[PDB]
């Protein structure tokens, strides 16, 4: 396939930001829950 | 210098296919021979050799003396 | 035993249903219900492809019972050829439904 160059290029820095935000959005709430499992169980 | 000889120019892909499928077939027979000797027959002989002179009462008495049983001390 | 009182399609069909009905009576197929029959497809005798715009997708079944259909846009102008079998197609643009 052929395509145009990006209309709004995403530089390496922007990509590191989108990658970091994306991972944190999965990792932090589940991490919070698993971290506090004991509190939930032996509540 | 000298002219180059005319090489084979037709059916090159089909020729490669034929040659490697026969090679796959001869490897497949070689592996089945290995497998039948390293796994299947090995297992048949381990079981046969184990039970050939197996003494189940002697086996039991060893277990009994080691203390493993609820019903037999 | 048998009076009337039920309308017919001729009396009461409307909209596109009626347009299809009336065109069929004239032997016409403006809404593409039938498969067109091929010509010989030469440059002199090309398959004539009606359209209401200046391009139409053709699918070419190059040989009878091919499962593969060859698709391409046919444009207003000089006849074009199927990229697989070469048979000729020519667009004939027109006016208000086919």
């Amino acid at each position: 396939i052929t395509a145009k160059p990006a209309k709004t290029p995403t530089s390496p820095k922007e990509q590191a930001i989108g990658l970091s935000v994306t991972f944190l959005s999965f990792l932090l709430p589940a991490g919070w829950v698993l971290y506090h499992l004991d509190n939930y169980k032996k509540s | 210098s000298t002219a180059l000889a005319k090489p084979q120019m037709r059916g090159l892909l089909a020729r490669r296919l034929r040659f490697h499928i026969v090679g796959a077939f001869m490897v497949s027979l070689g592996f089945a021979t290995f497998y039948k000797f390293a796994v299947a027959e090995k297992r048949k002989k381990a079981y046969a050799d184990f039970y050939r002179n197996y003494d189940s009462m002697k086996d039991f008495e060893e277990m009994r003396k080691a203390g493993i049983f609820q019903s037999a001390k | 035993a048998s009076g009337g009182g039920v309308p017919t399609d001729e009396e009461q069909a409307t909209g596109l249903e009626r347009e299809v009905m009336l065109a069929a009576r004239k032997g016409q197929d403006p809404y593409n219900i039938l498969a067109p029959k091929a010509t010989s497809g030469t440059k002199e005798d090309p398959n004539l492809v009606p359209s209401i715009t200046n391009k139409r997708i053709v699918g070419c079944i190059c040989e009878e019972d091919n499962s593969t259909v060859i698709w391409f846009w046919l444009h207003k102008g000089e006849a074009q050829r199927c990229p697989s079998c070469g048979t000729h197609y020519k667009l004939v643009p027109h006016q208000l439904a086919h």
């Binding site: - | - | 309308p7 009461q12 409307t14 909209g15």
Partner: protein
């Protein structure tokens, strides 16, 4: 009864840009509004009932 289909065909073919479910007139809009209000209202209430049934009542 008389056959009045032609009048309904004129009404529903009128070039007023209305979608078919509103093309009969203001009574369509009322019926639409009653239906969607009951559906959306009832859905919020089902969420309230889920939230209630999600916790023990000793």
């Amino acid at each position: 009864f008389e056959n009045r289909v032609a009048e309904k065909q004129k009404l529903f073919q009128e070039d007023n840009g209305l979608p078919v479910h509103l093309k009969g007139g203001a009574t369509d809009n009322i019926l639409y509004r009653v239906t969607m209000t009951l559906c959306l209202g009832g859905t919020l209430y089902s969420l309230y009932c889920l939230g209630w049934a999600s916790f023990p009542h000793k």
